[PDB]
Design a protein around this ligand. Structure first.
Ligand SMILES: COc1ccc2ccc(=O)oc2c1CC=C(C)C
Ligand SMILES: [Zn+2]
Ligand SMILES: [Zn+2]
Length: 325
């Protein structure tokens, strides 16, 4: 069924790719095939002299380290964030703003951003005194781990996709990737958003009508927010995709809750299956986190993101209308 897969992959540049269908068609290799497709589209193998076999080996290794038993934070979510970042990077307001190295950083960061996620929160890991919380001194535990695993896997057999980048490129790439993935810790959300707003308030556009970004701080800020948006893009996708995501995160939160209950721990917010309001929580999530983020983003790239914002709003109303009264 190589052809049905290939047809589905033609939508790689569109918001709302059917990533679950691609996961099925590809034999649960959504991250591998989507990354590969994206790297060919953007000509990254040629530009950075990445042997195609090294790329595929790395991708399969990377995908293998997402957990098949985790319902949300798995290779499908990783594939989704990659493809979403890929669309955001193609927004007219950002045309020719970012270098190829910057583009590679954003996409690689998206690919690795949740790798080896155990399906529980930083707080659970801190409360149980896990080795991970210990090694990372309780700070952005999962996120530091995602990075270290992602880079560490480059050392497996025929996995070094950066073998042909100069040392200066590698150092620049590594810095950008690190800055991006640490920004995906939800505890950094408010500060990211605050900085995004500031940038929007003093927004400058170029002669050619694209965003002006003068310095590393402004550049990396946008890339961080871009990937953060991709990470928080579920409520902005067609409703049939959104609802599957919602099912999956709830399943994952509810397993954590069960685990906290059987261990005698305080149950985390939204993790109690006996005490849950899925719909109301989605509305809350939209009102207080997702819509504030996407509206600010939409202002930065005005009017590129208007349809994404409209769908966000249609979807909020759907969940509002589905709250048990
Ligand atoms: C941190 O919170 C997240 C993270 C990722 C997703 C993804 C899809 C989604 O449907 O909601 C998400 C939420 C909010 C969930 C609830 C319980 C309000
Ligand atoms: Zn994460
Ligand atoms: Zn994520």
């Amino acid at each position: 069924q190589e052809d049905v897969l290939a047809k589905e992959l033609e939508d790689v540049n569109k918001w709302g790719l059917h990533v679950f269908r691609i996961a099925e068609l590809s034999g649960n290799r959504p991250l591998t095939v989507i990354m590969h497709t994206i790297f060919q589209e953007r000509d990254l193998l040629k530009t950075f002299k990445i042997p195609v076999d090294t790329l595929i080996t790395y991708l399969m290794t990377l995908e293998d380290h997402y957990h098949a038993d985790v319902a949300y934070h798995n290779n499908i979510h990783a594939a989704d964030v990659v493809q979403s970042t890929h669309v955001l990077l193609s927004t007219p307001a950002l045309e020719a703003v970012f270098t190829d190295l910057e583009i590679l950083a954003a996409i690689f960061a998206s690919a690795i951003h949740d790798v080896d996620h155990p399906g529980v929160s930083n707080q659970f890991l801190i409360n149980t005194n896990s080795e991970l919380a210990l090694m990372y001194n309780d700070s952005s535990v999962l996120e530091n781990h995602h990075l270290a695993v992602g880079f560490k896997l480059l050392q497996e057999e025929n996995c070094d996709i950066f073998q042909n980048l100069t040392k200066k490129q590698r150092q620049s790439l590594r810095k950008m990737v690190i800055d991006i993935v640490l920004a995906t810790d939800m505890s950094k959300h408010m500060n990211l958003l605050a900085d995004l707003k500031t940038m929007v308030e003093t927004k400058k556009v170029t002669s050619s009508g694209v965003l002006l970004l003068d310095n590393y701080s402004d550049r990396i800020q946008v890339l961080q927010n871009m990937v953060h948006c991709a990470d928080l893009s579920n409520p902005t996708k067609p409703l049939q995709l959104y609802r599957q995501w919602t099912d999956r995160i709830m399943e994952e939160f509810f397993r954590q809750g069960d685990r906290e209950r059987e261990r005698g721990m305080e149950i985390s917010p939204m993790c109690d299956k006996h005490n849950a309001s899925v719909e109301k929580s989605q509305v809350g999530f939209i009102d207080y986190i997702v819509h504030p983020l996407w509206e600010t983003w939409a202002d930065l790239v005005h009017p590129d993101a208007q349809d994404i914002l409209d769908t966000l709003e249609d979807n909020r109303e759907w969940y509002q209308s589905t709250i048990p009264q």
